[PDB]
Amino acid sequence: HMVNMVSNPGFEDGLDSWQDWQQDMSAVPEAAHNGALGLKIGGGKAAGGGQDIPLKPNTTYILGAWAKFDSKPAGTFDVVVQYHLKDANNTYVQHILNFNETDWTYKQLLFTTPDVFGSTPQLALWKGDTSKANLYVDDVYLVEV
Ligand SMILES: OC[C@H]1O[C@@H](O[C@H]2[C@H](O)[C@H](O)[C@H](O[C@H]3[C@H](O)[C@H](O)[C@H](O[C@H]4[C@H](O)[C@H](O)[C@H](O[C@H]5[C@H](O)[C@H](O)[C@H](O)O[C@@H]5CO)O[C@@H]4CO)O[C@@H]3CO)O[C@@H]2CO)[C@@H](O)[C@@H](O)[C@@H]1O
Ligand SMILES: [Ca+2]
């Protein structure tokens, strides 16, 4: 843990640097874990957003995040680093944190990138749950160790 690769990782600059795929995202105080703002992804449909992050090859990273649903979900909220390999079929690979908690929860995983990327890595915040539960996420981490 030295440098955070994620731009606008605490949503303190609103939605700056975050793609909004289903127009279901807002940066609002009610969703804050730290600072003034957090990301709210509205319940009722599957929705999310993300950021393209070029990574170094052959390198070990920690992916981490804080999340909570404001109500018991049926599915999960997922934070993912995803990219294609450069191989026989360009395998798609996903390093996935799953959340279903209604208290602020920090989760983290470790992964090591391939020698060659088949595509540019993407950090996705994917609230696949389809209940009425709203999802809060804040303080996302992607750091080389
Ligand atoms: O909308 C216009 C906009 O689209 C953009 O492209 C988006 C696209 O719209 C989707 O939102 C898409 O969403 C995908 C996520 O990126 C991610 O790939 C996600 O991956 C899932 C996976 O499908 C599967 O569900 C998996 O389930 C796991 C689970 O997490 C757990 O591990 C369990 O134990 O195992 C199961 C497997 O059984 O988990 C992953 C959860 O992250 O799926 C979504 C696909 O529906 O992302 C696209 C961007 O990458 C852009 O094209 C944009 O330009 C355009 O304007
Ligand atoms: Ca914040």
**Spatial strand arrangement across the major sheet:** 1-4-9-6-7
Given the helix and strand composition, which structural class is it? mainly beta
The top level CATH class name? Mainly Beta
Strand content: over 45%
Which fold name corresponds to the CATH topology? Answer: Jelly Rolls
- Give me the CATH architecture, please: Sandwich
Shape: globular
The kinds of small molecule bound in this structure are: a molecule of 5 linked components (BMA-BMA-BMA-BMA-BMA), calcium ion
Number of helices, counting only DSSP H or I runs of 4 residues or more: 0
In this structure, how is the largest beta sheet organized? Answer: 5 strands, antiparallel
* Radius of gyration over C-alpha positions, nearest whole angstrom: 15 Å
| H and E order | EEEEEEEEEE
Quick one: how many beta strands? Answer: 10
Distance between the termini: 6 Å
Share of helix, binned: under 10%
Descriptive report:
This is S-layer associated multidomain endoglucanase. Ca(2+) 1 binds at residues 10, 12, 34, 37, 138. It comes from Caldanaerobius polysaccharolyticus. The protein is mainly β and 145 residues long. It has one domain (1-145): Jelly Rolls. It contains no helices and ten strands. The strands form two sheets. The chain has a five-stranded antiparallel beta sheet, with no helix packed on it. Strands 2-3-10-5-8 form a five-stranded antiparallel beta sheet, with no helix packed on it. A hairpin with a 7-residue loop joins β6 and β7 (92-99). The protein is globular. A molecule of 5 linked components (BMA-BMA-BMA-BMA-BMA) is lined by residues 21-22, 48, 78, 80, 82, 94, 96, 98, 122, 124, 126, 128.
